[PDB]
Each structure stands twice: as structure tokens, then as C-alpha cells.
């Protein structure tokens, strides 16, 4: 375990000649060594001697078994010694014993667990978009705009591989809000908006939700419910000039603060006492300190509307499986369930339906535009019907609310599928109640 | 040192019954029923029975841990 | 002091308290030495 080689042992006399004893005992810790190595194979070492037959030995034999992850109920006696145990995965009776935390079970019916049908296949469906998103066209631009007059571009009808930006070492910051950047490739959006500008290093701190300052208030602001990523990098070698690259400016004065994604390029104040030009140039120079050097900033904002997505990450569309329990993903809409043809009369503008539980129960396929119904895979409770353990160890199992055809002495009742019980056409007083007029008893079977 | 030493013998199996249980930790407990999750030898499993001298001792997989037992006086 | 170096390339990320001192990549197009010295 984690590099620790643990040994347990026990040594007792045995009355058997050539087998293992039927009974119970526990092994005690012998040694625990911090070895720190991987083990995949092993071999047993024996002592040999040189006889007339060559290298030989007296009779020797051993047994080898393997361990598996299991749950056990262990019983400690008064002296703190383990005297008994239950393997909770051995059979339905042992499961009942573990559930009831006892080695003895009384006559009756007990619910021990639940069953669920697992998905047999996975499918993925995305829009048939072939173009790639022009991110390089924005990031690798020769010039960026001033912050008081920030630019915006819309990205649509394309595939966006966000790992090209995320894993880039060219960026000093890559701060995402509302979304994890490593998961962007699994999402679809209606649109993505890219805003860009040049500011000082120290001003990059203002490019976020809930911020204030000369830039946050008068040049560029993000909303409190912003979802997107803020990307910035040093451009001192590009956007700086000797004498000051005063071509870049920012808004210094305004009568009121801006709203999110607002822009104001008015040049209204002549100058004089208490009268100043609203814009202030940047003294961007190659010899400036790190926080005073120019940085290029790009902000990617995500848009979600009830409409076919036009910006999706990398896609691997598959075929469509029906009438089976499957995993699915419709334009980012993941889940597990059975998909079938729908009888729901959707109107052309409707892409999916919803229940009162706030779940999707029907979708429009992004490629065929047909409507599919979504249902959960079969599940239900499992109960064990037993005589007391003082009578017998034979049990019957009831699968609640399910057909016997979906389960894999098999009787179908209104309570569910009953397996292990022998149905008879006689009638008696009710012993162990099952439901809907049906009871069971020990008559032996 | 090393000696250049023939045929593997057919496999055989026995019943583990309820053997292979050990103390999962070093904490003292008494007069109590305790549920634990760990690597154990499953009850009533099929255990491989080897005879070194009915001659070899084959290399075996370790998998997830090994239960070993040997009956002898030699 | 290029005597001090660090790992720059690997095919997968390390687990906690893991160490890897392999020097496998010759260099060429899309082929680089895994270690990078410090200036």
C-alpha cells in the first residue's frame, strides 16, 4: 500500500493431512516496511540438498489465493479478538446480515439495496460546422486599440480549440469567471465576443467583475454576472516608443461611471481653470518599469441563448442509438438515459422540452432535427425474503416495480419480480406479506 | 553460486472457506461489531494448491495482494 | 549558473512527490531535449 509492504501471519497446529481447515481465525500484524517499490510478480524460495538423484528436497506444498476489495462485518469478543466475520458480497443473506448489523436475522422481508441499469453505449452529437474560429487573427494582430476606444469582434459559426490559448506561455494571465478553462472544449455557445485594448501592466488588475478605478470606471467594465476569460500579455517590445508612444490614450475624466461593456469616445471638455480635456496619453517607453510597460488584453465573453450553438469546441460526432440505455451529449447537454422517437409536436423554434423537476425530457437532434424523448434507465429496490436464520439459510429475492424480463422459480407479481419462491395454486394464512394479495412462507422450500 | 537446474505440473484447487481474515488496523476494540472495507480473500473462493516436490516453483502474479499458506513439519 | 536545470517537456504530468530524471528526447523538428538550464 503506497510503497508500504505489510505482512500479517498466524501459526497453528492442524489435524488435517493435506488440506486447509474449515473454521475461523484472524491473522496478526507481523511487520510493516517502508520499501517504496512496485511489485507485480513473486516466487517462493525453498531449501534443497544434494542427493544421489541430484538437487532435491523433502515433501513440500503450499496454497496461493488473491485478495479483492470487499466489505466485511467483523465481530470482536470480550477479549478484543476477532472471532467471526461476514462477507457482505457473498450472497443475499450475507447482505441482509450486514445491512441489519447482525449475525442473526429474524423471519420477514427486508430491503437491502437498489438496482440500476447501466449504459451500454455512448453517443455524441454536435452541429455540422467545418470552419475554425479566427482566434489567431485577433491575438496575432499587428496593432491593438486604445482602452478608451476598445475594439470588439464576434466569433461565430466555427470550432474553437481553447487549448491553443490556455496552454500558451505567451500570456501572463488567463483568468476565467463562471467557467473552468480546461472544460471549454466540451462546451457550446451561441456566440463568443472578443474585446481588445492596450493598457499599463498595473491596470490589468482592473479588468475584472466588481472592479473600480480609472479604467474600470471610465474605459472598460465587466458585469458582476460576467462569464468568460481575461487574457493579457506584455507588449513592451511592440507598443512602446522612445519619447513616449502617446498614440495610446485613456479616458481620465467623466461626469459619471460607465455601465458594463459601455464605450464613450467624446472629446468634450476649451481648457482652463477647472476645465480639462477628457483624454490622457500614455508615456509608453521601452525603458519603463514592468508595471508601467504596455500590455495587450483580450477578453472572451460567452453568450447562451435558446438557439443552435454556432461556437463549439472540438467535436467527435457519433451515430444515434435508440431504445437502449446510453450516455449522451447534445451540444454540451450531457446525461444518461434511453432515447426514442418522440410524439411531441414541437414547433420549429423549439429545441427542447422541460418537466416540472427542471429536467430535459426531449431534445431536437442538431443534425437530423428530429425530436427525441429522454427517459431514465430502469431502477428499483431489492428486498430479501427470509425465514429466520434459526430455520433455514434459503432466501427469495424481490425486485420492486420491475418486469422479470429486465432482471438478468421466476414469478411476476404487482409488487415486482419474485425470484427463488415456488408459486402454488393453494391458499393459506399470510405469513410474510409481499403485496397485492400475495404472501410467502416456508413449507422444505 | 547459481546452479543450472523441470516440467510444470497440472493445477489443483481447494476451498478457502473463511480463512485469510486479519486485523485491518492496530486499534483496540472489544465487545463490538465493526464494519470495514479492505482487501480480503473472498469467502469460499478457489485457492491454488502447489506441490514443489510431488519439480518446480513457478513465477506467479502478485495482483492486488497474496494469501499464502503452507502445511509441513520440515 | 547553468549547472541548475529544470524539466521543460514531458508527455504527461507528474503525481505528488513523483520524480523523473529521464533524458530522452536526437533533437530536430518537433524533437527537443526534456531539460532546460537556468540563466
Amino acid at each position: 500500500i503506497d510503497g508500504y509492504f505489510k505482512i500479517y501471519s498466524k501459526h497453528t497446529p492442524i489435524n488435517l493431512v493435506r488440506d486447509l481447515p474449515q473454521g475461523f481465525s484472524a491473522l496478526e500484524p507481523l511487520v510493516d516496511l517502508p520499501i517504496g517499490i512496485n511489485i507485480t510478480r513473486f516466487q517462493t524460495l525453498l531449501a534443497l540438498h544434494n542427493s544421489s538423484s541430484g538437487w532435491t528436497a523433502g515433501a513440500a506444498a503450499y496454497y496461493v489465493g488473491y485478495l479483492q476489495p470487499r466489505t466485511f462485518l467483523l465481530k470482536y469478543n470480550e477479549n478484543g479478538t476477532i472471532t467471526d466475520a461476514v462477507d457482505c458480497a457473498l450472497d443475499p443473506l450475507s447482505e441482509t446480515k450486514c445491512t441489519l448489523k447482525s449475525f442473526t436475522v429474524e423471519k420477514g422481508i427486508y430491503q437491502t439495496s437498489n438496482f440500476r441499469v447501466q449504459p451500454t453505449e455512448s453517443i455524441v452529437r454536435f452541429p455540422n460546422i467545418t470552419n475554425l474560429c479566427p482566434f489567431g487573427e485577433v491575438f496575432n494582430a499587428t496593432r491593438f486599440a486604445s482602452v478608451y476606444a476598445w475594439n470588439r469582434k464576434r466569433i461565430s459559426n466555427c470550432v474553437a480549440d481553447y487549448s491553443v490559448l490556455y496552454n500558451s506561455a505567451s500570456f501572463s494571465t488567463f483568468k476565467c469567471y463562471g467557467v473552468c478553462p480546461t472544460k471549454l472544449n466540451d462546451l457550446c455557445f451561441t456566440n463568443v465576443y472578443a474585446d481588445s485594448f492596450v493598457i499599463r501592466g498595473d491596470e490589468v488588475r482592473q479588468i475584472a467583475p466588481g472592479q473600480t478605478g480609472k479604467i474600470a470606471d471610465y474605459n472598460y467594465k465587466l458585469p458582476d454576472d460576467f462569464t468568460g476569460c481575461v487574457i493579457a500579455w506584455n507588449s513592451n517590445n511592440l507598443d512602446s516608443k522612445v519619447g513616449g508612444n502617446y498614440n495610446y490614450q485613456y479616458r481620465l475624466f467623466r461626469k459619471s461611471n460607465l455601465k458594463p461593456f459601455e464605450r464613450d469616445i467624446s472629446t468634450e471638455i476649451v481648457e482652463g481653470f477647472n476645465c480639462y480635456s477628457p483624454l490622457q496619453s500614455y508615456g509608453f517607453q521601452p525603458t519603463n518599469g514592468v508595471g508601467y510597460q504596455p500590455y495587450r488584453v483580450v477578453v472572451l465573453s460567452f453568450e447562451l441563448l435558446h438557439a443552435p450553438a454556432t461556437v463549439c469546441g472540438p467535436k467527435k460526432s457519433t451515430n444515434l442509438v435508440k431504445n437502449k440505455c446510453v450516455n449522451f451529449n447534445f451540444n454540451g447537454l450531457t446525461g444518461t438515459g434511453v432515447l426514442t422517437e418522440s410524439n411531441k409536436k414541437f414547433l420549429p423554434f423549439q429545441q427542447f422540452g422541460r418537466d416540472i423537476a427542471d429536467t430535459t425530457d426531449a431534445v431536437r437532434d442538431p443534425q437530423t432535427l428530429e425530436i427525441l424523448d429522454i427517459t431514465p434507465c430502469s431502477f428499483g429496490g431489492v428486498s430479501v425474503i427470509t425465514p429466520g436464520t434459526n430455520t433455514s439459510n434459503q432466501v427469495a429475492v424481490l425486485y420492486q416495480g420491475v418486469n422479470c424480463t429486465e432482471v438478468p422459480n421466476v414469478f411476476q407479481t404487482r409488487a415486482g419480480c419474485l425470484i427463488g419462491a415456488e408459486h402454488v395454486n393453494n391458499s393459506y394464512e399470510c405469513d410474510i406479506p409481499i403485496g397485492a394479495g400475495i404472501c410467502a412462507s416456508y413449507q422444505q422450500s | 553460486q547459481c546452479v543450472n537446474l523441470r516440467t510444470q505440473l497440472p493445477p489443483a484447487y481447494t476451498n478457502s472457506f473463511t480463512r485469510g481474515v486479519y486485523y485491518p488496523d492496530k486499534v483496540f476494540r472489544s465487545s463490538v461489531l465493526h464494519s470495514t472495507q479492505d482487501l480480503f480473500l473472498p469467502f469460499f473462493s478457489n485457492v491454488t494448491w502447489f506441490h514443489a516436490i510431488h519439480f518446480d516453483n513457478p513465477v506467479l502474479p502478485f495482483n492486488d495482494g497474496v494469501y499464502f499458506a503452507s502445511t509441513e513439519k520440515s | 549558473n547553468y549547472n541548475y536545470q529544470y524539466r521543460l517537456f514531458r508527455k504527461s504530468n507528474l503525481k505528488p512527490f513523483e520524480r523523473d530524471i529521464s533524458t530522452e528526447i536526437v533533437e530536430g523538428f518537433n524533437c527537443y531535449s526534456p531539460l532546460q538550464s537556468y540563466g
Partner: antibody
Amino acid sequence: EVQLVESGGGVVQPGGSLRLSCAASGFTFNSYGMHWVRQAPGKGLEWVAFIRYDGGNKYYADSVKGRFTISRDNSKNTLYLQMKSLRAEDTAVYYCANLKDSRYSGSYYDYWGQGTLVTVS
Amino acid sequence: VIWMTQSPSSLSASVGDRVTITCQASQDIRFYLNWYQQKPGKAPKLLISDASNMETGVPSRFSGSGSGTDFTFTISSLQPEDIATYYCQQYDNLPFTFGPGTKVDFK
């Protein structure tokens, strides 16, 4: 002595399904993990899937992942491969094997079965 | 996925000739490489494991070497029975992969 016998091969249509099995004898099957490997006529070997001795974990190649399922029965010493949504490219001879592997299978020996031909048309 | 390649794709040689096959891994697989031999109509047979570990029963004329990404297989004295296609398998990481194979023909 040690045997691995593939069966269940046949001819099916695209979009259909087929279940293969491999019987094992002569060794402690329940102690070893197992691999499926397939080979088209005139082509090299393609690894398909691996399953642990306990039937716990399952591994698949990207070429079959999401379509094929590997399973086993240690009581009947039999390895299984359940293939759905079959394609023409799945035409190959499918082998069961106990591959010698110092890292994963833990096996010190290497055994291959006869192989069974599956055709999709 | 670790990709395996081999060189040459094929070669021919006479009896007594020395034959070599080169394998290369896209990733460092230490010495975790198996060498398999296959003839038409038959399943692959393992000749070498862990790069250079010769399997029991394999004739002394066979050998293997190499490490990291660069591996080799050699036949010191080719026999009429050694005409077969050899494959490299890496088993450092799941999923496991096989190379394209190298064919040895008869000159």
C-alpha cells in the same frame, strides 16, 4: 497443456452486433488478466482491450472505445468481448491472449489462442 | 497513446547472414518492449520481453538490446526457419500498442 480457444465468429452487417468468447484451460485462469488483439488479413496486430483478473477494471483502444465491451467469467474460465455498432473496418481475426507484462498483467508467460474470424459486410 | 515504428519494412538475407531490425517509440518506454515473431496462419510468439530478456526455449542466435526510445533485434546466424515477420509491442502505458512489423524474407 495450456489452451485458449476463441469462438463466436461469423458474418454480420454494419450497425449490427456480435459477441465473442474464449475458453481457457490448463492454467489458473482466474489468477491472470486477459487481452484481446485483432488482426486483419495482410495487416499488423491491433490491440483491442484489457481486463483485470478480477474482472474489475477495463481498458480499450480508441478504435473500439465506446463500441466494444470486455468482460470475463472466472467460474467458467471464459473471456468475452461484446461488440456493438459494428463497421466494415472491424473485419479481422480476433485473438485472446495472456500477454507477458512486467507492469500490468503480472504474467511471467505468454500464450495466444487460435483466433476467430469476424467479418462485417 | 505511444506510437511504434520499425525499420526496415522488409529485408532479405541468406543462411548464415546477420539480420537486424530497428524499432522506435514516440515516447520513453524504458525497456518495456516485447518482440514477437509471426508466420502466416499462426498466432504471434514472444521471443524477447523487457527489451533484452530472452525467453526460455529461444535459440541462442537470437538477441535484443536498446533502451528509452531506440530498440533493436538481432539474428547472429540466419537459418531457413527464421523467415518471419517481427513485431514490437510497448507495454509501458495502457492502451498497449504494436508496431507495423518488419518482414525477413529469403535471399
